[PDB]
Paper text:
Attempts to co-crystalize MANF in complex with BiP in a conformation consistent with client binding were unsuccessful. Nonetheless, the BiP component of the crystallization mix yielded informative crystals (at a resolution of 2.1 Å). Despite a truncation of the C-terminal α-helical lid (28–549) and the presence of a V461F mutation (known to inhibit client binding), in the crystal lattice, BiPV461F molecules were packed with the hydrophobic interdomain linker of one protomer engaged as a conventional client in the SBD of an adjacent protomer. A similar daisy-chain arrangement had previously been observed in the crystal structure of a bacterial Hsp70 in the ADP-bound conformation. Interestingly, superposition of the NBD–MANF complex onto the structure of BiP oligomers reveals a clash with the SBD domain of the adjacent protomer that engages the interdomain linker. These crystallographic findings fit with MANF’s observed preference for the ADP-bound state of BiP, but suggest that MANF would be excluded from the core of BiP oligomers.
Residue numbers in the entry: 29 to 67, 72 to 132, 135 to 527
The structure:
Amino acid sequence: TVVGIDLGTTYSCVGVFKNGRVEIIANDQGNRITPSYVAGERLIGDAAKNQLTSNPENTVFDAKRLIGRTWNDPSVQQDIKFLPFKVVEKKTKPYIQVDIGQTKTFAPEEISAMVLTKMKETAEAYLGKKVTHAVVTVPAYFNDAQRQATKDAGTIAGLNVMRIINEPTAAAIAYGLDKREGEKNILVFDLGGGTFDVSLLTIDNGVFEVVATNGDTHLGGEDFDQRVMEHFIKLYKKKTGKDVRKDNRAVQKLRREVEKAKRALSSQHQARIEIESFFEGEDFSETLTRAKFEELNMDLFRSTMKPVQKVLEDSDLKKSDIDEIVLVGGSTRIPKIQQLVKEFFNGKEPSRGINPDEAVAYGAAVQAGVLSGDQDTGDLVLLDVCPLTLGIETVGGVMTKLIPRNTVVPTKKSQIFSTASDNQPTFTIKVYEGERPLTKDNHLLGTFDLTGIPPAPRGVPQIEVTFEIDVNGILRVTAEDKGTGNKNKITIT
């Protein structure tokens, strides 16, 4: 069976379509999203990320920033300034050098391969079978090199990447926006852990097109965490006099608490940050209000509107021209974000229902099912049918059908006719092809007579007219006096 994988900058997610529903699969730790992190032993996911504070030089993350790019790419030269691990050119490509005290050099797609191996190892456990096929998502702005590099990361991990799909397109498919009538302008607002992407999608009768894209490559949920961590470190110093910044474990534990507290503030107006051994055996427990969280981050929040205005004016659209707003990324749970977006679109409510950090993985899994042979319902048999309507002329030049259009061949169909006059001694069978009610508007294929009808009043004699089509398309029309056994036939080609 084939799975859907969201391979994100900061977190990755895996889903699958089974028993008429998509299932987002939790990992060994029970988390439905896995950090895109790799760190004597080799660690992948939550374990690797927990090591960052103590061993930054040899903890690899944000490989998606480098994948399928050249060393002299201004984006690469900019990003390597703030990455703690060693990035070196080799044949014009950026390579990551870490200490396993063995030193090793990894291509970005090799780090991504390890992350995909973990997501593959998450789905196999749940399903109880080996996973060999996947639909993998990429940002809409990815070029062929970045798409191929992502394909190669799947191949190294032992997956047949059937399709590579745009992240905004996958989000739209999760909300079933592909299964509506007419044309729709859709904005995708994607605020992830480390990246902000805005995408203007057009859908005209099932067909998706990415009109324009914008955002900020260095804005995400983790920037909101940093602002809160700053606040509580400053406050703890003021409350006590202990500076905590250089205590690896203190910052590690504070980050965990701020992440969970932030998520609670998406549901409630107050959350408690409780650390048990914060610094030198001292406990720390404080309340963070929603109001205080919003105050610390309001300028970051307001900055997400600027790229939204740019995609609109780059695509020659007004706010009014937008039909749907789809929210993607964990950070779009933040009530103030949803409030700002709604305010921006003069009272229009963004689309919600799917957990916004699972939306891309959900949509990937839907397309996965569409290419999955496991979802087999029932088989078809081709029918041989007659493309034309065949019949005979009745009193008044009326078209009486014996073989309707799309009747299956071979066939034998009989209808009973009688005389239109008292002691009528003969019938003329006039064979017609066409759809019109008067035979004058239809095509004559031929005629024959049936003579020697014994005398009787009108409507009393009983004649069976039979139309026979065999395999060759040979039409054979028979008229039989059922009373006597009198017969005549014609064969039309």
